Amino acid sequence: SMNPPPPETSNPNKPKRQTNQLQYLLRVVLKTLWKHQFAWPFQQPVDAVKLNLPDYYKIIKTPMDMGTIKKRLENNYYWNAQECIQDFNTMFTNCYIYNKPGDDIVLMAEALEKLFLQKINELPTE
Ligand SMILES: Cc1cc(/N=N/c2ccc(S(=O)(=O)Nc3ccccn3)cc2)c(N)c(C)c1O
């Protein structure tokens, strides 16, 4: 099986804006997670071909990753902070669906998610 195309990251038919929350999500949240020691599985779409995961895209229909999120932020793809937050949550959830408790990748997701949630608790005002 081929990989699916990656998620879209730019669309000139959507309106654009910068908000203080979206700024925080790129400059604080995304950049803090990106440099973490456990970021590496999450920095690009899951390459099911290269990683020998032939059922990955049979199970995961809404793939998401932080490379995609970073590009979406940088391209003003998101209008609402919640859309971005949702993408992070999808990314974690997919990892929990496909993998099992105690897998190394799950433990890495958990740690990154706890950090994510801490930072989201510190989002500034609308
Ligand atoms: C999200 C997710 C990601 C997964 N793998 N992601 C990977 C992402 C990148 C690599 S890498 O370029 O070899 N870089 C490495 C490999 C090992 C250690 C540090 N960096 C390997 C795997 C994976 N195998 C599953 C099952 C997942 O659910």
Swiss-Prot record:
Ubiquitously expressed. Residues 17-123 form the Bromo domain. It is found in: Nucleus; Chromosome. The record marks N99 as: Acetylated histone binding. Changing N99A: Abolishes binding to acetylated histones. Phosphorylation by CK2 disrupt the intramolecular binding between the bromo domain 2 and the NPS region and promotes binding between the NPS and the BID regions, leading to activate the protein and promote binding to acetylated histones. In absence of phosphorylation, BRD4 does not localize to p53/TP53 target gene promoters, phosphorylation promoting recruitment to p53/TP53 target promoters. JQ1, a thieno-triazolo-1,4-diazepine derivative, and I-BET, a benzodiazepine derivative, have been tested on tumors with success. Treatment with GSK1210151A (I-BET151, a I-BET derivative) has strong effets on mixed lineage leukemia and promotes myeloid differentiation and leukemia stem-cell depletion. Belongs to the BET family. The NET domain mediates interaction with a number of chromatin proteins involved in transcription regulation (NSD3, JMJD6, CHD4, GLTSCR1 and ATAD5). The C-terminal (CTD) region mediates interaction and recruitment of CDK9 and CCNT1 subunits of the P-TEFb complex. It is also required for maintenance of higher-order chromatin structure. Chromatin reader protein that recognizes and binds acetylated histones and plays a key role in transmission of epigenetic memory across cell divisions and transcription regulation. Remains associated with acetylated chromatin throughout the entire cell cycle and provides epigenetic memory for postmitotic G1 gene transcription by preserving acetylated chromatin status and maintaining high-order chromatin structure. During interphase, plays a key role in regulating the transcription of signal-inducible genes by associating with the P-TEFb complex and recruiting it to promoters. Interacts with p53/TP53; the interaction is direct. Interacts (via CTD region) with CDK9 and CCNT1, acting as an associated component of P-TEFb complex. Interacts with RELA (when acetylated at 'Lys-310'). Interacts (via NET domain) with NSD3, CHD4, BICRA and ATAD5. The interaction with BICRA bridges BRD4 to the GBAF complex. Interacts (via NET domain) with JMJD6 (via JmjC and N-terminal domains); the interaction is stronger in presence of ssRNA and recruits JMJD6 on distal enhancers. Interacts with NSD3. Interacts with NIPBL. It is linked to Cornelia de Lange syndrome 6: A form of Cornelia de Lange syndrome, a clinically heterogeneous developmental disorder associated with malformations affecting multiple systems. It is characterized by facial dysmorphisms, abnormal hands and feet, growth delay, cognitive retardation, hirsutism, gastroesophageal dysfunction and cardiac, ophthalmologic and genitourinary anomalies. CDLS6 inheritance is autosomal dominant. A chromosomal aberration involving BRD4 is found in a rare, aggressive, and lethal carcinoma arising in midline organs of young people. Translocation t(15;19)(q14;p13) with NUTM1 which produces a BRD4-NUTM1 fusion protein. This is Bromodomain-containing protein 4. It comes from Homo sapiens (Human).
